[PDB]
Structure formats: structure tokens, C-alpha cells
Design a protein around this nucleic acid. Sequence first.
RNA 1: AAGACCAGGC
Lengths: 196, 133, 114, 49, 43, 165, 98, 85, 783, 267, 65
Amino acid sequence: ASRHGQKGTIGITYRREDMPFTAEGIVPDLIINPHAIPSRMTVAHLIECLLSKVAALSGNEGDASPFTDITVEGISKLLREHGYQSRGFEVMYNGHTGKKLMAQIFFGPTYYQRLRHMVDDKIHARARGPMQVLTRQPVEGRSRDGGLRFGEMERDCMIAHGAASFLKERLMEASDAFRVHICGICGLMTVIAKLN
Amino acid sequence: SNTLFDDIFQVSEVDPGRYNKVCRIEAASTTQDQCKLTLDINVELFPVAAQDSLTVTIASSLTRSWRPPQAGDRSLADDYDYVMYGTAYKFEEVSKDLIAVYYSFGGLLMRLEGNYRNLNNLKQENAYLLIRR
Amino acid sequence: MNAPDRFELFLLGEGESKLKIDPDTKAPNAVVITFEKEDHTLGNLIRAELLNDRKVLFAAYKVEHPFFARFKLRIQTTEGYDPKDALKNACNSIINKLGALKTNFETEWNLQTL
Amino acid sequence: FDMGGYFIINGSEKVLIAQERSAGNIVQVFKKAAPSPISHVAEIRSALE
Amino acid sequence: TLSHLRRTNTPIAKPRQLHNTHWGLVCPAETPEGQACGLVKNL
Amino acid sequence: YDRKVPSPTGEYVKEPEWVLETDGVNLSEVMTVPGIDPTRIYTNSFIDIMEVLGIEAGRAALYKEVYNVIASDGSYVNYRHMALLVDVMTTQGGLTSVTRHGFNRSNTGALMRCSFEETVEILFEAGASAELDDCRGVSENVILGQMAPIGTGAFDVMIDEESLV
Amino acid sequence: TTFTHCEIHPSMILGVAASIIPFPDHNQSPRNTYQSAMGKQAMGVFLTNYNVRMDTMANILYYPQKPLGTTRAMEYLKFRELPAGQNAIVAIACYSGY
Amino acid sequence: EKAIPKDQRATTPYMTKYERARILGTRALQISMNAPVFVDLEGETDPLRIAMKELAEKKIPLVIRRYLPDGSFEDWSVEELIVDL
Amino acid sequence: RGNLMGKRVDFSARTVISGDPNLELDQVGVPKSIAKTLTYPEVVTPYNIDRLTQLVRNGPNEHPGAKYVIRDSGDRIDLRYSKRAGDIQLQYGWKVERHIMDNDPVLFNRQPSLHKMSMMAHRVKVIPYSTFRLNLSVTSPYNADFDGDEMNLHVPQSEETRAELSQLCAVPLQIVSPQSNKPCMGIVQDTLCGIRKLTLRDTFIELDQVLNMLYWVPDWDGVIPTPAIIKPKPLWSGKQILSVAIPNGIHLQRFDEGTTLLSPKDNGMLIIDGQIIFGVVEKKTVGSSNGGLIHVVTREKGPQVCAKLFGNIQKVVNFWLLHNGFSTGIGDTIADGPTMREITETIAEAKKKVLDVTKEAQANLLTAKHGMTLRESFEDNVVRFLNEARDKAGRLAEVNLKDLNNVKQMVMAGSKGSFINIAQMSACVGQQSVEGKRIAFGFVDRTLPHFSKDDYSPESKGFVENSYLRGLTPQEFFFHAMGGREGLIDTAVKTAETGYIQRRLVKALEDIMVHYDNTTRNSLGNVIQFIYGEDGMDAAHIEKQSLDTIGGSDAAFEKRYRVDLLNTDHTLDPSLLESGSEILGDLKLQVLLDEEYKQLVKDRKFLREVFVDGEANWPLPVNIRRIIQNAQQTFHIDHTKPSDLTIKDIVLGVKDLQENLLVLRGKNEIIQNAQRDAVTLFCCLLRSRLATRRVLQEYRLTKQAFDWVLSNIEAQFLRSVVHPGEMVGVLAAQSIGEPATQMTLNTFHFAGVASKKVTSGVPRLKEILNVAKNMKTPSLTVY
Amino acid sequence: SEEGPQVKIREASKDNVDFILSNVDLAMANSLRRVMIAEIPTLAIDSVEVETNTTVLADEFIAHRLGLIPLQSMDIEQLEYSRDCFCEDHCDKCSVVLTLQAFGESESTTNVYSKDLVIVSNLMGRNIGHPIIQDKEGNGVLICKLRKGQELKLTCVAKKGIAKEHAKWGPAAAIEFEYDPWNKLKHTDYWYEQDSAKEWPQSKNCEYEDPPNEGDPFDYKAQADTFYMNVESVGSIPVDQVVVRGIDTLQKKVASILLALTQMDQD
Amino acid sequence: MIVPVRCFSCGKVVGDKWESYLNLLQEDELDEGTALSRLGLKRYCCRRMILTHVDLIEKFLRYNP
RNA sequence: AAGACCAGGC
Ligand SMILES: [Mg+2]
Ligand SMILES: [Mg+2]
Ligand SMILES: [Zn+2]
Ligand SMILES: [Zn+2]
Ligand SMILES: [Zn+2]
């Protein structure tokens, strides 16, 4: 994420040959999507990333210090004399064709941060395995090669569905499933099954 | 086959309403009294001034897919400056005789008004529109 | 760790041959070719060439999933002119431009000082 | 850079967290609930230091 | 590390709402979402 | 308040009207008043409507008030779903809430009632009032881990008969 | 017209972790709360001496990068001198839909 | 005891989603296990797609027992239930 | 409640979700290492034994593979060890635990699972990368995005557990949903945003691209359609090529505002058989809206034919956008010099408005608004003069937005962004609030230590003069700060509160399922609704159809349904019917059109006393309008040549229909009397769409076509009857509990007046359900 | 100059080729730019065998580091790819081997360069595996640093690969590319507030075309023709060659397609 | 952390310039921008390669063992 | 094993 709470996985990765490219022949280390902007109302991010255009360029200081008198008009005025389109925009070219992009783009340098939670320490999957001793159920946790809780709230939406055969198995042969001997008179588990 | 309508209109309004290539156009026909035309022209192919003498025509051919023209032998029915392709989508009774038709060239609209498109404009999925001069 | 192989972007792993041609059963006389281990570098370029040939009614390529090397060409031409020959000429044409562009460039470069 | 302020308890660093609580020995008045025998209550939490 | 060394805790009127008086003494923005939001504070 | 009313000519007209709105409830006392239409008067307290105008008038008001939470909110649920709630809270007699003081105190299946709240005293007095259990509730059949009498498992399947071709 | 005191600099009301926000006053006010939880979730050099300590989990940035956009509060925070974050070049387009 | 006569049967004469779902499955069970097959398997070699083929032709030999809430019930064969749905 | 009802389970996965715009709707990008672990235990049959002996040899290492091979006298054979994983002499009768593989029944969940649509069958598409991919448009019902959530998948280990997975819960046959008798997946984000772009009147494409898009649609019959423009340079309209995604005989019509079949705004929507005639496509069409394209295409064509439709729309739109671009710059929140100027003087004027009322309240001339304080009426007077001021400023930026404005453009698609955003960001932020009141006096007699005491003015009390692009002041920031947390608080409190509400609902309805006599019951077999939903209908097959006889003058109704053969002036002109001239005069028939026209007053009477507000638009089964166009399109009817049905054909056949529309079948009067009742509404609509004057006059049906209209209806109706079994208990709870989660600002918008406040939202819902004998806002409304 | 696509060199250097590229199709100039980036092969270290690394950097850090170091690829043609060459693992026919030994002798920091890499494998007299030094002083790329008692002993084994493979291999850098500055073909629509002309900056290449002017009805027939580039070498291959081989690699793998039609044609 | 060989964004070798940079700032007293000029970084993704860089290695060496 | 606590993720 950037520094204005713009949480974002990664999704796919293109080599510089497919990526949109400016007329100068630059390439974004990162595409994110205009939809994560106007509902979230993070205007500093559209600032900082403009701001750091004039940082990279003039070798100058990124004074994003809060209650100063630094303005968007300001930044830009500097950028406009500094060689560019004052509001960010740069006519990028599509990668595959090199056909000019009908939109122009706000092209920014913007401190992003790489957070904990990489995909590969949570990619759990089980088909049976270890099993608690008390209740004969899937041990817990992703690092015990556990299994997922198919909690009651999950249950409801199988019943809603009317999926009966499933919800059964997915509660027996996917879990506890056991075999005891019952009394035909009293009905309890007394029966000393001296089997074989 | 074969034409279905012919008349020469005087353009009395060119509204570029918040569009950049396209345009709504208002016209009366030089000859015919109670006749009027409202149409969407692609101004960025064919510039439509005020008061031009646009000659309007509606064919219906000269069926399968499309082929790149192509004038290797091809000669489609045009001494025509400008040619679109439409669908009729509602036919309307504007009192007594005064009938009106509605055409779509993929969203480029066309409203037309008279009373003698009878033996001519039968409810079709055909129609090519042709302008000249 | 569920990352594919890096070179599978140009090595045809056994089985996979480079060109597979199959007959388009939608519209008469037209075919759909599959280029294992290729993309827009190559696709877009052939497709545009097929476009200067007046004998080709229809021509398009599409990268089905960008996970994968593959891309698909669909070619349609006029009765009498086999689809593959279109590829063959638009291919040879590419070469004859490229081949010429190179030597044009060189007599240029070979002028400059610095 | 490591600025201190923790402890080390079996080679595991430990930060004591500020605990927050209402001060003692200040006097305060509280209009008690609408269905109750008492109208207002004055309260002093008293402790020595 | 810097932030955890400047933490706060409050156990059990309107004790999560950022109160007028916090101005300059607690951070107006630092606090964890949900579970114990507004109670845990950073100076 | 705005209100649409049949015209003396056919269609519905906007006829506006003076409506009185209150802070507090005494029903059996303000409908008995002169000047006021005692046939349209309404109160958001569905507990009073229930007591004054009977259960059926209640069931209706409860709905109005449930639906009002939803449709004020921007949403729209289908009448069937809400009404189905509204009817359960009603077919008992008065107003059975959706808490352990409502549905759960009713005499459904011992096993199915226990899975909600107060798991122990529910099972206790069940051993005490020695209750036979249907095992027709979803929950019972879950516990025991057999297929519920639910959608897929509402019927049974058997063979023919005809046999062979 | 009857002052007694004066603030040092308004910026100071902010925490440690919200003082990395570059124009938090141009941002809407939850968000900053969010960043404030993620500043912490970051990777970078957490200590100029990791090659010597021996703890469960470390996570260090191959190339960390003091940002192009700073807050006077960062200096006393030691941020330009120990970042987590890199000045990634950034596109705001719908491209491939991914 | 007890049933309900083959005449005076109220229930939807159609076959419900929930009915067929279980029918197919129960067939798709016997099919997946090597029990014999009642249609010219036209290429199709999958138990469930086969059941769908036997279901379309009505050569599934099974009977729903629909229980009413009073306890008594009505029988319907898969040969005699309309499969519009 | 924790290990019996229910449990931790085997045969599952979790990972981070990721959006895949080249995946199928009902698919499930699954990582290969997962598919390397989970295992459907397959029996061995001569139909499989080849692709199965194959499937052993690959072992648990290569993808399409297998561990353990179960035999008779049940015995495991572990295929990563064992001196025999290479040999292996299979048999019909043995099981083989193959890897999960392409195109498989999985059950793909996401918490919190408050829905039948948080669960679904997806089809399995094995992929690279440790991640689950899914089509963007299965985003809505799951309520994912990819700030990196994380989702589950359970693998059925039986043949009918996978039948029951796919014949029942599969993503498509889930598109249109009981909850709101409308569909719960639409087009979203880029797709939804550029579909608007692509579709503008201004948008044209030329050959090259037109052929790749064409080719990019997978069910495209290889028929390049003729371009709208053939003149200089054959060009296509965006609208045009798009239609190649929309199937055959798909008819749909709208009219938004001032829409004239000449759409001088290019608004509304008219789709005439799988081709679009006018009107910028966006949310209201391809959204998950009510009368929209997916509602139609499903009901109409299939679920499959519709799920296929999902993909196509994207495949094209996405592509078009991949080569159009869309960005959003900070340049997108800059207004005119004039407009910033005038915006600020907007606040200035409304500033000295609040200032003058304050100055009045001070000379003790502020009059006591009846029923409120002196003070409290001042709170009203301001927050009103202050919102008033901010919205006006806000809608003054909205006027000033160019049409090429990235913000304004997503707002127009309806992809992200609404009015307040533009408002905020560019204009003024507005008044802040905690506890419904402006900012607390927190320090004794003022808000922040920086103003004098007793300061009632806006900037003291917590108005934010500024935009976000403007920047905010220190104090302004803090007050924002304060309204901030308040939200974050109750978002934590709401999702917990409503989370318990649902748990109770669900456990309070549970086994209320519809039994095989169409009566809603439970474990004791108590009756709850004698006929489910009051009408025996499933809520998916239902739609907002307009009751033609409620509105309009008696005069206007008259000339609409009246047929008087004995009046020369009110007969069916012999142009309409083929018998027409031979009909004029005639008692024997007039007695039928008479008692038809009486039956239709009994109707207008009966409805006007049910729906007492005139509201003529009610949810109802079997959309008749679609069957009519569908008839007059299938059968190609010319609107000059005379129909060919007797009055006896129509009248006597419409009364014939109504017999066959069975919900209940019992052969005794009691049952047949609720049968008469469950249908009463529907048949109103019937008689109002299928009346003599209408069938003849308006949509000119021929005998042959008519009998088809009559036929579909019967069959469509019968298909709409709720299925015995249906677990309507749970269905009903989650159908109420789910919106409850999505309830914003749990205060109100009644706080413009300082006590027009009425408890609404989640607090109310808590009372209602608890039967709260001491509510916060009791009130009489008196008439 | 002749038949097909024309080239004009505006500026040239060992680092940058500036050129117009006239009378070519769009689809081509691009497919060039693309191969240029990804597909013209080159040598770079692919395998490190570390013996001692008492350094303050991690092993596989420094591995990655030499990964990037630009090795001389002017004779890349006579080296086979390891994957092909019939030699178990590697030989002098398919791989260059390098050696890096350094040690802190100084109390002061002991810097470590690419000038420091020493070859070993038999070069069989060809141009291959000289770490390119564009530096003013004679030591480019600063690999790692050593304190005092610090030691690094390793054995890089450069092999032939391409950008698609890993970017350590692409010889290409930044490639400036542009078609038609005045937006005559209206392939883009300029965002604005006031006046697009005062609001965007006339391209560098504006002097190399005509005015819009002004005036005349948009030209619909006009196609994507003429392109402006300026290709920049990383060092391994000469600038001038990067195009040449780009143009060629394109031609070569279009030819492999043609050829591959001849085979499957058998039956 | 040691100056990167090659800019993440374009690929131009920037690693051989950390040397020549610190020198151009200290001995010639230039400012960051005009020193990035003289070093031949014009595409600013490469200007960002250097100006953002913190050379933490210098501290790690500081540790004796 | 497993209980307790704390951080934390949608
Ligand atoms: Mg979201
Ligand atoms: Mg999310
Ligand atoms: Zn016993
Ligand atoms: Zn070798
Ligand atoms: Zn760079």
C-alpha cells in the first residue's frame, strides 16, 4: 500500500514490453486503478505522486509537511516550467501495439510500502491428516496442516441451498464420522461389542 | 433494390450538443411543404454547415457477411458523398396522414416526416441512408 | 512456489509443436492457428500484414490468458486462395521489409561520426 | 538507533504499556439514571501516594 | 518499534470517541480498527 | 403530508392534508377523541396496536415497521421474507420476540432448542420433563449427522416395479 | 486579542506513525487511521544490526529508499535514515483489467 | 397402512429441483460404479452426464415418496413426473 | 454450538483471491499445488480405466496425478512410497484418489457467509501461482475485492454430492436471487466504466480493432456485421459491435428522463432483438438492477446462455479499454477561477446568515419553534443553513465539471463515486458531527483551547470551510478527526450487533420450509403461512409488473377496454378483426364483451381498495410484456392486416387460461378456494393485458400467435411455483440479516430538524426483534 | 537507401541512436521496440558458486548483484546456450567462467568493483564476458564493500539468455518512441481545463512535422506512418548493433514460423 | 544498502555512479539535481534511483566482527 | 500435545 491506506495485493505482472509506456520510454513499476480513488477520497495520494515528480526532477525536497501553505497550483506551476503537463498527465502508448492511449495518465513516483502477508505463508490445503484426540477432528492452524472450520453460519447457507446430501458428508466423511452399538431395549451405548 | 425515398433538404440547425464527432441536424425539404428531417451526422467525416443542400436518399441494397469494399471489381450504388446503414424501429401516426419514421445507424438516430413513404418504407431491417452535395 | 517456469515463454516443452492449424467451422473457408510460445511482438505484426493483402476477408489474433505463452490467429480468405498462403506471403513480406530496413539503416549508421 | 525503553526477560524484549485510569482525589458529580432512587451522586476516589 | 513504545491502554460515558481534550496529548489518528478501537491510544 | 386520492373524474390526484405527529403513546385514549379519523390513526409502537386493535392489526404494524427499517435504508427485500418473519412472531398468539424469551422458550425439539442459547438447562429440564424428540428439526439431524429432512432429503427414493424394459 | 500561550507547530498533535502521512490534511480522516496500522505492517531495516541478533522473524528490504515526499516530523523519527518503502513509479490506469 | 391412492394425488405433478438433483446423483452413483446402463451412450462417458441422458429419456427406474406433514405420502415414478423445470 | 453444529473439515483450501478478467463467470482459478493435495475418490470403471492408469503414473508429483489407490478389503496403497507406484495393476471396482482437475464441482465460500450466495459451485480451472482467481462479476454476492481477502473451497467426495453441488448452487443458477427478486451479480468497475465509454454516440471503431473484438467474442458466428458508416472509411459504432455480445430476441426498453424515441440525450435504453438501437449503456442496464439486461437474459434465455453473456461483455469491453485507457488525475478535482471564487462566496453569504440568526438569538427575539427549546431550534437553524450551504457549493462544482472528467465519468457509469465525493474533494467538506450534534463543547464552554468561551459560530463549533484539494486547517483537521473515529467506532459496533441479530433470526426460522402441500411449516408441523409468501410463488421468478387498470381517468380507462358492438362508434373497426363488419350489431357476443367489461370494473374497484395509494407497480410472476413482444417477433405480424380470432377465441380462451394456472391441486372446495385466492392478483394483470380491445388494438395478435402467448404463460407460471422442499426459513432470515450489515450512518437524515429524529436503522431493528416494551421514540401519527 | 522502410539518424553515439523511421507500418516499429527489449540475446552471470563471504551482505544478495553486471556480448553468436550444448553442465563452448576474490587489507574501506572480475574459461579468442566499464575512472558497478578482516571468494559462470528469461539479460534500457506529435490522426484526446495548446507541451519532435492548420476537415484516410526513436545501450552490445540484431531477431523468428509450416505439412 | 546496479524502471546501470555522486556533492558543492544532470540521468525514474537511495552499508561495516 | 493471553487479517 501507499501511505494513504490504499491496501492492494498484487494481481498480475507484465514485462516492460507489454506495459504502457510514456513517450520518453518509461514504464510503471506499478499500475493501480482510478476506481480506488474517488469513493475513498484520498486526495493527498494524487498530490504526493504529483509532488514527487518535482522531487525526482529538480533533486529537491518533498515537503509534504501538513499545515504549510504548499498548493496544488504551486507544485504544478513548477512542473509546467519544468517540462510537463502540470496536473500529472502524460500521453502514454499502449504496450502491445504502440498505438497512443486515448486517455492520458497521471504518471507518478509514489512511495509505496511492501507489507507482511505474502501469499505463500497462508496457502493452506488439506485432504485429511492429523486429528485432535478428544473430538477426532481436524487439528487447528495452517501450520499444523490443519483444516478449515466449516462453522454453523456456513451450514445455514447449505441448508438455504437445500443441499442435504452434501452438508451430511461434509460433516461426517469430511470430519468426525464414527460407528457405535446401541441398545434395542434401553437405547444407550452400553453394548459391550465383543466383535469378530 | 432500388430506391425508396428521394428529396433535397435545407439544413436549418446544426446542434453539436456536448458531442465531438456527431451532430443533430434539422432540415426542411426545398420542394415539399409539410416535410421535415431530424438526423445524426458524423461531422468529423462530413462537415455539415447551416443551410446546405443535403440530398437525402434511401436504398436497400446495391444477405450475408461483409467484405472489405473492395473496388477490384466492386461498384456499390453511389455518386454519394456520405453513406450510413440503419434499422427501422418504430413507425408513427402524427395525425390524419402525417406519418413519421425512426431509424438507427447504430445509435446515430433519424426522424423523418411526410405521408408518401407508403409503397416505399415497409417495416424493414433494411435501409441504407445516402447523402450528397 | 506455484510460480511457473521462467523459460516456458519460448521453450516448447515436449509434445507442444509450434504451429497447430485447425479448420474454423463457423464460416466457409477460414482457419484458426495456434502459435505456442509467442505473443503480441509477433501476433500483432502478422495480423497487420494480413491486412494489406486484399485477398484476406478477415484477420485477428488474441492472447487468451496472459499466464500462457500461446496466442491464436484466425484467418479468412476468398474462395480459391488457401488461408495458409496468406500467412505465407504476409510472412515473407515482413521478412523482405525487415531484411531491407536493416541494410537501409546500416548505410545510414555507417555515415554518422561519434 | 535502538532507543531503549523495554526490558529483556529471557532474551525476549518486553514493552510495558502505559495503563490509563481515572484520577483519584478529584471531586465529581453524576446525575444518576431516570428510573432510580438517587438524583445526583458526588464521587471521590481516595488513595494515598 | 517507535510506536509500540508510545502505547496506551484503557480497560472495561463515551470512552472511545476522540475527545476534545485529546488535542496535543494523544494522536488523533493512531488506533486499531474495531476490536479495541479508541481505547488503545498512542501519544 | 402529501396523499394521493381518487379524483371525482377518475385518476389519482395530489391532495395534501394536515397531519398531527406526536412524542409519546396513549392509544386507547386519543382514538376516542372528536375531530380525528379513528380509522387511519397510527403509532410506531406495534406493542400497543397489538393490545388495542388485536393481533392481526399488530402483525400488520410489525411488518410496516420492519419494512420501514429496510426501505428507509435504501434497500428493498421481498415481501415474502419479511412477512415470513412477521408471521412466526405472531402465530403463537401475541408477539413472540426473537430471543431466548421468544421462540426458544417454545416447545420445539429439545435438541434443536439447545443449540441456540442456555445449552445446559434446556437439556437439563429435558431429562427432567422426560421429553420425546421428533428429530424433524434441521439442527437435530445435523448433530446426529444424518441427512436432514431438507430439500434434497425431504422425500425418499425407491426402485420399481417396472422393471425391466 | 488576549492570548497567553501559543502552539509550537500544529503538526505536533500527530502520533509517531501518523507523521509519515504526506499531507494528512488533504486526506479524509479515517484512511490516516488505516495507514497508521500499515506503517507498522511494513518491511524494511528495523535495526542496523540484524546480521547479529537472533530472533524469530526478520524482514528486511533489499533496497529501501528514503521517500521523495517527507514530513518535517520524519527527521526526529529517523525515517530518511531508516526507511521501509520504495519510490515505485506509478500508473493510475485501467489496463488489462487485472 | 397407509400411503394415498394413486388417484386423489394433490402434489405438484412436476419434478422439483430438489427431486431431480437427488435422482441424477443417485443414478450417477450406480453408474459410476459399473451397474448397467439404459441408453446408447453417445460418446459421453461420465456418470452424471449419462444420468442426464437417462433422465431425458425417462429410463430411470426410481420412485419418489413425497411425505406430507400429516405423515402419509404420495409415490411418483421418474417415468411419470414431468421434467419441465 | 462449536464441534457438533458444525465442525473443522478435510478436503479444503484457503488463499488470497485475485481478480481474473479472462476467466469464466462460473470458474475458480485454482493453484496447482492445492490441486496437488485435494482428491476426489473416483471409482474405476471401463469408462475411466485408461485416463486413470495414466493418472496414477504421474504420481503425486506431476499435475494430473494421484496418491493412494483403494482396493477391496479396504486397503491404502500410498503412491509416493511403495515399491509399486510404477507398476500398478488396476481393476473395475477399485477407487483412485485422483487430484482435483480441470472443470470440477467445487464449493467456493467466503466469510462472513451471511447468504446462500456466499456459497456457490464454481468450475475448476487449475493455474500457476499460489492464488485463487475469480471473475470480477462474482465479486458482488461474495462481497470480495482484492485488498487481499481470502476464501475457501471444499471438495465433494461423492457423485451426488457433486451433482447436488452443481445442479443446485452452481454460480449461474444463482444469478437472479430470491432475496430481492432481482439478480445479485452485475457488470462492475473497468467493465462497467468503459462500457459507458465504448457506447457513447461519439465512439467509433475501425476495421483492424473491430475484427479483434469480434474474434474476442467466443460465440461469434463469424459474420462481420455491416458497419453503421460505409461512406468515407467504413466505421462501426461502439454500440454496434457490443451488440454482438447480446443474444437473439432480447428485447428491452427504458426511458430515463426526457426520452423521446429520439433520445436527444442518448439516454434511456432500447434493445430490439440482440442489437441496441439507442442509449448509453451503464449501471441501470448492465448493472445488477431490476429491469436490467441480466434479469431479462436469465429469465428469458437460460442461466448458461446468460453466464456466457457475462464473459462476452467483459472480453470485448475490457479489450476496448486495454486500448483506450482511463486514469484519474488530481487535475480531476480543480474548478474554475470563477467557480472556486463563487463557491467560496457561497459559504461567505451563508456565513453571515448564521451570524445574523446568532445575533438575533442574542437579543432574545428568536421565537420558540413549537415543541422545542429556544436553543434547540437554533441547532436546527444552523446545521440547516450549513448543510444547505455545502450542498449548494458542492452541486456548483458538479455544474463546473467538464464531460472528460475522470471523476465525473465513473460517477456517470456508476462504477465508483457519487455526489458527495465531488462535493467534499473539490468544493467544501462541510459540517462535522458526533452524536448527531455539531462538535461537543469539550473544554469548559468551548471546543478547542484556541477560541474564546461561549462561541456558537460555525468554525468554533466544527464546520470545515475547506475542500480536500484545498487542504484543511489544524482545528478543522481535528474536528474531522473527531467525526472520523465516531464512524470507525460504530462500524466496529454495528458488524458485531447485526452479526448477532442474524444468528438469532437464522436460529429462529431454520426449518420453516415449504412442504409438499405448498403450506409453510416446521418441526412440529405448525402452519405459518397457509400458502408460501401468500401466493405460492418462488421469489426469483417474480418482477415489478405494472397493473394496467389502477391509474388513469375513468374516461381514459373507458376508451381503453370498452367494446360495444351494439354501438356503431365503439365497435372494433373491421380493420382490426377479420370478422369485424360481420360482428356489428349482435346480442349473443355483446353479452360476453359486456360481462368481460364488468369483470374488469370489479377489478379496478378491487385493486383501488387493495393498493389504496394508486401505486400500480407491483412485483409479480410471469412478465407478460416480454411474452407479447416475444410473440409479435417470433410470428412476424404486420400492423395493417386484420387479425383472425373470434371474440369467442379471446374472451373464452382467457377464461380458459385461468383454469390451468394451478398452485394448489386438491379436488375439494376448501383447497380450490385458496387456489381461487392465490391467483386473484395475477389474473387482474392477466385480464388487464389480455382484453379484447387491447389484444386487437394495441398489439395485433393472430390466432396462431395468441395460442402461443396463452401457452407460454401457463408453462411459465407453473415453473414459477415455489418448489416443495425449499428451505424458506433460512432463506428468510439471511434475506433480512444481509442488508442489515450494509446499513450506513445508524443515526438518521431526520437531523436537519433537531427533533424530527426517529430511531431508524440497526438500533430500531434491535428493538422490533426484541419486542421492546420501552422504545426510544414512541410517536402517534394522527389523521 | 532502397525499396522498403526508411531510416534517418538524427544523433548517434556509443550510448544513443536517435532516428526517424519513415514509411513503415505501425505494427512493425512496435514489434521491433518489443524484440529490442526482450529478445536479443546476451551473456550475463547465471551461476554463483560461493566459497567465502564474511561480508556484511547476504550470499544470494550478491548473487543477484552480479546478476545485473553487464558482461561483454559482442561475439554472443559463437556461444551455444547451455541447454543445447552437449556438455554435462557447462564448458567453454557455452559459458564464460569468472572469478572474484577480494579481501579487506585496509583499515579504511576496501571497495569492490566489476573491474575486479577476472576471467578463467578459455575465451577461444572471441568477444565475451568483459565486464563493461562505462565509468570515467575505470571501475564501473560497485558490487559490495569490505570492512577490514572481510573476505569474498566466488566463481560466477555467465551464460547466454534473454530479457524474457530475466531482465539481467536484456541489452536495452529506455527506448523513446513516438508517432505524430500534432495528434493529426486523433489517436488521443487531450484532457484539459482551458486550451489544450497552452496546456500541454509541444513535443520535442514538433519541428520535424507540419502545423495542424487549422482549419481543414480532419483527415480520415491518413494512417499510422512514421516513428521517432532513440534507443539506448546498456553496454554489452553496441547501440548500433542493438537495432541491427533486434531487426534481425524479429526476422529470424518470423522465419522459424515459415519454416515450421514446411514440416507439419508432410502429412 | 549499497547502490543498485540498474534502475528498477528503465534498466540503465546506475550502480557505477554512487561513487561519482557523493564526490560531486561534497568536493564540487553542487545540488542534487545539477549533479544528476552531470551524471547522465535524464529519465527521472533513474533520477529517483539515486536521490531516494540510502547507503546503509556504511553502518553495517561499522560493526566490528 | 492442550489450555491461557497478546498482536493481527478480510
Ligand atoms: Mg470493496
Ligand atoms: Mg476487501
Ligand atoms: Zn440396554
Ligand atoms: Zn557447454
Ligand atoms: Zn530509469
